[PDB]
């Protein structure tokens, strides 16, 4: 589209910027361990809550990258896990809300990042990655295409970020290298690149430096189609002490909020975050949408 006035509809906000930019070069918002909503047993909800609205208040408030946990049951199906304790959601329950959506607002598009969350079921007929590409990613929403994705390829699908090893079906992105608890940076598919800041698990201090110093690099190196930041603004800790998600996120959000607003740059990447509402002061998704205005 042209105007900048449309990256102001949360519902819509894809919808003025062309369709030959890579997804790469985007800067959209994303929700780490999105299905965590449900979890209101208290010792879970301080350990594993990240989340307090639905995937669609989700989606309808600019998330449009998802942190999909799963694991397979006896059932034959994945469903939604944190860590070895179980989300009540599922897998399904997931892929329609992103349909409903997407069929709702055509112009947008999601990416769906899935990870084996836990040990698959005893029970299970399959492997993780052979079920979820005969029972669920044969689905058509999934878009099938490989390399650099452009924008105008996904409208209307669901594009994988695969989190998992063994997988058979060409789609979305590459699994790659991801070390634990740190940023590091690897290459995707032949022409792709990603550095990711990941420490989840450390100080608040480092934390703070670890995603502005990744924000640098990237309004830095800014028109380089050609690779993907990913920064997690997620901290987690020891819990049932105000050392929960919560806590640090009541914090680190307003404040990298407002570290986009004032630096006005031009491509923040994706940010990966908890607690999406809007609580919080400045409102982390909103600027990181925001510095899209230099695309338009």
Known sequence: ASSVNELENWSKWMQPIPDSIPLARISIPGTHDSGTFKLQNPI???WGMTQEYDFRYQMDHGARIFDIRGRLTDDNTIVL?????????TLHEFINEAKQFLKDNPSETIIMSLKKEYEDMKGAEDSFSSTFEKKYFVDPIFLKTEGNIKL?????????????????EP???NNFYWPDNETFTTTVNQNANVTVQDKYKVSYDEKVKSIKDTMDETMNNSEDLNHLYINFT???????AWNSPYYYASYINPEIANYIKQKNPARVGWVIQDYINEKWSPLLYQEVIRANKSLI
Do not use: E, F, M
Not at 152 to 168: E, F, Q, T
């Open 81 to 89: 896990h944190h860590g070895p304790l179980y989300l009540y959601v």
């Open 44 to 46: 879970k909800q301080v």
């Open 152 to 168: 105008g390829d996904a409208r209307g699908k669901i594009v994988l970020l695969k989190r998992y090893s063994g997988s058979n």
């Open 234 to 240: 997620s901290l987690s800790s020891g819990g049932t």
């Open 171 to 173: 789609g979305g992105y």
